């Protein structure tokens, strides 16, 4: 039903966002920089995750207020 469409959509979106790691020509110095780049990516993704978690909490508050107003 709705679950297998949500799942295939998730797989599809994550696939489209994935970058190809090509490191085979890089020397030691380039690899250290490549590692720093990947670390920064992880950081930025964690930062976005944190913003979404904060939004989620404000949304639950807003929804509760809306439900009270309706009642």
């Amino acid at each position: 039903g709705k679950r297998q469409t949500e799942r295939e959509k998730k797989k599809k979106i994550l696939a489209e966002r994935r970058k190809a790691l090509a490191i085979d020509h890089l020397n030691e110095d380039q690899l250290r920089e490549k590692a720093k780049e990947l670390w920064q990516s992880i950081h930025n993704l964690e930062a976005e995750k944190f913003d979404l978690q904060e939004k989620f909490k404000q949304q639950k508050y807003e929804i509760n207020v809306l439900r009270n107003r309706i009642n």
Binding site: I13, K19, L31, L38, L45, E48, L52, E54
Partner: protein, 101 residues
């Protein structure tokens, strides 16, 4: 004027707790994403680290997606409930028209 300024400082009053979600955030990121230790890793070790980090990128993106999906569903609910709640120059003109006058 006084009312406008009043509804100004009563924000000044909240700058104060934005100001806290920022020393906050500091540090949830504190790790979840911790600093790299690169000193003393040889060539092979660096190749493996790059692969490890790239794999982590995938995992974190998946976790972000999951939270994002919940946020998206909340937006749909907020939009629906919001619909429901009330359901139940003179200068130039003056020179031209009047001249010296």
């Amino acid at each position: 004027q006084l009312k406008t300024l009043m509804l100004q400082i009563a924000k000044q009053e909240m700058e104060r707790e934005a100001e806290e979600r920022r020393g906050e955030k500091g540090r949830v990121l504190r790790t979840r994403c911790q600093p790299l230790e690169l000193d003393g890793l040889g060539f092979e070790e660096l190749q493996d680290l790059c692969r490890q980090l790239h794999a982590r990128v995938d995992k974190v993106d998946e976790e972000r997606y999951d939270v994002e999906a919940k946020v998206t569903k909340n937006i749909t609910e907020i939009a629906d409930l919001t619909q429901k709640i009330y359901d139940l120059s003179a200068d130039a003109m003056m020179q031209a028209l009047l001249g010296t006058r």
